[PDB]
Design an enzyme around this catalytic site. Structure first.
Site, PDB file in Angstrom:
ATOM      1  CG  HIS C  85      -1.939  -1.159   1.199  1.00 37.16           C
ATOM      2  ND1 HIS C  85      -3.122  -1.139   0.481  1.00 37.16           N
ATOM      3  CD2 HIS C  85      -1.926  -2.338   1.860  1.00 37.16           C
ATOM      4  CE1 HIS C  85      -3.788  -2.265   0.694  1.00 37.16           C
ATOM      5  NE2 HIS C  85      -3.072  -3.024   1.528  1.00 37.16           N
ATOM      6  CG  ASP C  88      -1.757  10.477  -5.376  1.00 37.33           C
ATOM      7  OD1 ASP C  88      -1.649  11.722  -5.206  1.00 37.33           O
ATOM      8  OD2 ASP C  88      -2.034   9.949  -6.498  1.00 37.33           O
ATOM      9  CG  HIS C  90      -5.813  14.377  -5.623  1.00 35.13           C
ATOM     10  ND1 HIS C  90      -6.990  14.234  -6.314  1.00 35.13           N
ATOM     11  CD2 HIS C  90      -5.066  13.288  -5.923  1.00 35.13           C
ATOM     12  CE1 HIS C  90      -6.973  13.089  -6.983  1.00 35.13           C
ATOM     13  NE2 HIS C  90      -5.796  12.482  -6.769  1.00 35.13           N
ATOM     14  CG  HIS C 125      -6.259   8.018  -4.689  1.00 32.47           C
ATOM     15  ND1 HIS C 125      -5.391   7.307  -5.497  1.00 32.47           N
ATOM     16  CD2 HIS C 125      -6.409   9.230  -5.269  1.00 32.47           C
ATOM     17  CE1 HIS C 125      -5.024   8.068  -6.511  1.00 32.47           C
ATOM     18  NE2 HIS C 125      -5.643   9.248  -6.396  1.00 32.47           N
ATOM     19  CB  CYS C 126      -4.165   3.127  -1.652  1.00 36.40           C
ATOM     20  SG  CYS C 126      -2.829   1.908  -1.689  1.00 36.40           S
ATOM     21  CG  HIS C 135      -4.885  -1.157  -3.756  1.00 32.05           C
ATOM     22  ND1 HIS C 135      -4.083  -1.237  -2.621  1.00 32.05           N
ATOM     23  CD2 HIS C 135      -4.654  -2.281  -4.467  1.00 32.05           C
ATOM     24  CE1 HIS C 135      -3.382  -2.359  -2.681  1.00 32.05           C
ATOM     25  NE2 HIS C 135      -3.725  -3.024  -3.796  1.00 32.05           N
ATOM     26  CG  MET C 140      -6.707   2.042   0.793  1.00 32.76           C
ATOM     27  SD  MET C 140      -5.500   0.696   0.615  1.00 32.76           S
ATOM     28  CE  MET C 140      -4.349   1.251   1.869  1.00 32.76           C
ATOM     29  CG  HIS C 245     -31.035  17.485  -5.673  1.00 27.60           C
ATOM     30  ND1 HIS C 245     -31.333  18.492  -6.566  1.00 27.60           N
ATOM     31  CD2 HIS C 245     -32.109  17.385  -4.857  1.00 27.60           C
ATOM     32  CE1 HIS C 245     -32.524  18.993  -6.287  1.00 27.60           C
ATOM     33  NE2 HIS C 245     -33.020  18.330  -5.242  1.00 27.60           N
ATOM     34  CD  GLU C 269     -32.122  22.199 -10.769  1.00 29.51           C
ATOM     35  OE1 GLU C 269     -33.115  21.452 -10.573  1.00 29.51           O
ATOM     36  OE2 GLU C 269     -31.988  22.902 -11.809  1.00 29.51           O
ATOM     37  CB  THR C 270     -28.374  19.151  -9.275  1.00 32.00           C
ATOM     38  OG1 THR C 270     -29.678  18.806  -8.812  1.00 32.00           O
ATOM     39  CG2 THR C 270     -27.605  17.881  -9.566  1.00 32.00           C
ATOM     40  CG  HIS C 296     -31.170  14.468  -9.036  1.00 29.49           C
ATOM     41  ND1 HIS C 296     -31.955  13.978 -10.062  1.00 29.49           N
ATOM     42  CD2 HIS C 296     -32.015  15.113  -8.192  1.00 29.49           C
ATOM     43  CE1 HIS C 296     -33.222  14.316  -9.853  1.00 29.49           C
ATOM     44  NE2 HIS C 296     -33.298  15.014  -8.701  1.00 29.49           N
TER      45      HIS C 296
HETATM   46 CU   LIG Z   1      -3.898   0.000  -0.993  1.00 34.28          CU
HETATM   47 CU   LIG Z   2      -5.458  10.713  -7.763  1.00 36.14          CU
HETATM   48 CU   LIG Z   3     -35.097  15.661  -7.957  1.00 34.87          CU
END
Ligand SMILES: [Cu+2]
Ligand SMILES: [Cu+2]
Ligand SMILES: [Cu+2]
Ligand SMILES: [Cu+2]
Ligand SMILES: [Cu+2]
Ligand SMILES: [Cu+2]
Lengths: 329, 328, 328
Positions: C85, C88, C90, C125-126, C135, C140, C245, C269-270, C296
């Protein structure tokens, strides 16, 4: 009576010679594209398909002008092609982006002129009546960049200048399989049609690739940069949604809709380019090493082929990142 | 408060309204009659037991101004077999109205809500345990809540449309037999089991504008003229779409559909996520046939998400000219 | 030699003790994540899955710091786990987000430090060489919130304060199924690989869940709020697009890309969070009762499991919405 100029196009991911700031007033800019149908290999297992290309490449090459220049395109369909073709520019106004004025059969030639009234990066693609998605999703699409006459801004009043620009074209391919799950070959482009329409109707690509193949922008072909270098990444997708991400990087400025008169998004981890759009992202590298540039649906990236590398030279910055304790027992 | 009664019309046309409000807030009265019926959706004669507001896919566009009140009479006649209701994305509380409007065959209900927020919004049916089945059977529409002082460019300057069109994009999930032919059913109830299996795959059999493949082409093309300013409202209750006008642009676009936000300009293609309404404002500068598509071109040309515009006027050589026409 | 602090992390959807505004100058903030492989049940039919988790939850817990602080993460892979494992961010710059410096075999431990130089919510994330999607879609992943030192603002200079923040991790699972349609079970995690890879290649999830299971945030586990309360909802999806939503609600301020230096969208709304992103929505509740929070695409929500509930206390507002006549 406007001054004329002639562009020598280059194969992606590279871009032909151009200025950011325009030199003088409006020009008529001349380009030629020669249609080529041919077999290509798209993965490591040898899978081939009958690609339909502008100038021999998937994607088609990047055209660069400035706002209110005129584009004059010569489109050529040599007598060695079997099918009808045309071209639709999203940057142009009228007649289906030029689709309706550029229908060329094997042996034919046409010339289209349009005003580039609007600043941004735009898709161009083939769109022949009754077989549009088949031509586009066979690799017959590219992009055009129309720079503001005074070059790029941060949308907050300040001029910005890139050192280099790369063009990454993303392609969804739809290759039929037999009972076993092996991809199939066909003697002619014509014989692939029926089986290809069956796969397109599932809306599930067999492959998603950059520059026409799995691994096309890795190894020797990785995109080169250096710490302190300003790089612009143009990304197009004629048919399907994608979500670019630079692994270990960011997008400092991103025009996700691809239109420079709009203020860019800042500090982006991941950005969204809808099918039928070109986007652009400006980054200054701050850390050396290998970077991955991917579609961050990671099945699309690592299983289906949508992954490129950057190789970046320069000195490691311990302030930004450091390993305090290396992996051990 | 003053009261007004509206006469709704079949999409893609929109009932009489003003861009700017006249006088202060109103209670605006609308009536929708639920109608379950068989419709044909393609040129091979494929059938589907649709569930509709006022007998159209999509439901009609409702038009009010910000801070008006909407009073909705929802009628479920005794000829329908199913339970229904309405959820308004424009409304605040009780699942958008869903929990106050549950009407069985023979029942009637009245909902009132304040339209506090400006924009275009989805309305749809949402019966407990049957929500996606009703919505992907066509039981959805949209409401346009204009700002009291009409539309702006988000830079202080008022903008005025000559005409507004409503385009409803519907994803349908029609089951097949072992041959690959589409199945027909005697009743709506008998279609459920098989329909729920196709929905589970997230792959529509059809994606259409205004209820069928070809619904907005030929005789039923959308009419415009060089110099005419046109607003295109576009809704999708359930699935993402990416509208593009072939040979055109979006000069002003509200992709999320909420007008207090500054629009994007000079757009080639724009993005409306499932569960949203959006609006794009364009001034036509050239005549001819235009196509309006979902720019997943497989979804547009193979599954049916394609409309035509017929535009009158004089050709402009400066913008585009054929130098040499196609030949050897 | 800045001041050091230690965080005690909590199980999502709750968030550890933090301040919106920073108290003092830059700090070094210490977190510990212990990896755990284990079987979990993801639906009411007892479907099982070999999950790959940070700290034993899906998603992993929300980490909170302020801009220009340093994150010091201890990552532990106990000897009871079977796989390699890593992690990372972002939010970090260099070495594949820290993935190339954090490769831990069972029995291994690593420490990583990075400057949080950019404000927003971000995915972690892994991402182990040649096994990344397996993964990530095994659960993960989680997120990190890097707040601006002066707290959140609207676009136009004014400061805004939430009373509560919830974290909603959306997970797409790809569980294999035998011809009849019953979900397969495996003895070890390695035995599930080959069959899982085939489901993944269809790009069609078997399940889409909030907080690791169908109905994980309903009933006793519903999110709690009151009329007048200001609530921040952080939402992440490490692999796949989603369109949140609030049914009965809105997004008053939305950062759909999740990066706070950009002006937020208003009256949504969304909203749309692309795969590989965290977003954030700020809402003030105006109305009591049961709210639904959904993706939605209502198939993904009600059929596949992407649905949660809020329980909201307070007084009903007749102005915003009233039942003139109840169904009869
Ligand atoms: Cu992993
Ligand atoms: Cu990524
Ligand atoms: Cu709706
Ligand atoms: Cu072609
Ligand atoms: Cu196009
Ligand atoms: Cu209904």
């Amino acid at each position: 009576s406007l001054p004329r100029v002639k562009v020598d196009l280059v194969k992606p991911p590279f871009v032909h010679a151009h200025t950011q700031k325009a030199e003088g007033g409006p020009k008529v800019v001349e380009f030629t594209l020669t249609i080529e149908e041919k077999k290509i290999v798209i993965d490591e297992q040898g899978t081939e398909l009958h690609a339909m290309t502008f100038n021999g490449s998937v994607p088609g090459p990047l055209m660069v002008v400035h706002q209110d220049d005129y584009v004059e395109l010569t489109l050529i369909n040599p007598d060695t092609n079997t099918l009808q073709h045309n071209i639709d520019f999203h940057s142009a106004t009228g007649a289906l982006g030029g689709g309706a004025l550029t229908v060329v059969n094997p042996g034919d030639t046409t010339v289209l002129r349009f005003k580039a009234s609007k600043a941004g990066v735009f898709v161009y693609h083939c769109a022949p009546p009754g077989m549009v998605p088949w031509h586009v999703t066979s690799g017959m699409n590219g992009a055009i960049m129309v720079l503001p006459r005074e070059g790029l801004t941060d949308g907050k009043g300040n001029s910005i200048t890139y050192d280099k620009v790369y063009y990454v074209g993303e392609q969804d391919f739809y290759v039929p399989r037999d009972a076993n799950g092996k991809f199939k070959k066909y003697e002619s482009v014509g014989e692939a049609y029926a089986d290809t329409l069956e796969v397109m109707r599932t809306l599930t690509p067999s492959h998603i690739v950059f520059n026409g193949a799995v691994g096309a922008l890795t190894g020797d072909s990785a995109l080169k940069a250096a710490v302190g270098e300003k790089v612009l990444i143009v990304h197009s997708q004629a048919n399907r949604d994608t979500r670019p991400h630079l692994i270990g990087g960011h997008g400092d400025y991103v025009w996700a809709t691809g239109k420079f008169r709009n203020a860019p998004d800042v500090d982006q981890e991941t950005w969204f380019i809808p099918g039928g759009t070109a986007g652009a992202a400006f980054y200054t590298f701050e850390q050396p090493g290998i970077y991955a540039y991917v579609n961050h649906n990671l099945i699309e990236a690592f299983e289906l082929g949508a992954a490129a590398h950057f190789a970046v030279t320069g000195d490691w910055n311990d302030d930004l990142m450091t390993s305090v304790r290396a992996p051990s027992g």
